[PDB]
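Lab notebook, bench 4. Continuing the backlog of folding jobs that were queued last week. Each job is logged with the same field layout so the records can be merged later without manual cleanup. Today's entry covers ribonuclease T1 isozyme, a 104-residue chain. Filled in by technician R.K.

JOB TYPE: sequence-to-structure
TARGET: ribonuclease T1 isozyme
LENGTH: 104
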Amino acid sequence: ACDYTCGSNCYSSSDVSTAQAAGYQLHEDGETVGSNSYPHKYNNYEGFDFSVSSPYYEWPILSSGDVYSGGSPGADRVVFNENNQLAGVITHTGASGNNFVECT
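JOB STATUS: finished
OUTPUT FIELD FOLLOWS
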């Protein structure tokens, strides 16, 4: 079993924690990477009922297990807050118009 399923990608909570650690460090340092400048604010247009408080930031989690370092972000993201708490794992897979669905 996979802790999170994003389309056909299977992530363990340890893949998620590693991705969240890297994105939070950059957020704390006020730094970005990639043409889309991650980690960036996540507006939550979808209305996900996250149990941790906004503001939210999104950061790519890669199906290869590597930490995002600039380069293609893929469709999957970890979402965290300023308290370094995980809000969720979401994906562009199966959505249109730059929207997201939640990884189950």
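OBSERVATION: The chain has one domain: 1-104.
SIGNED: R.K.
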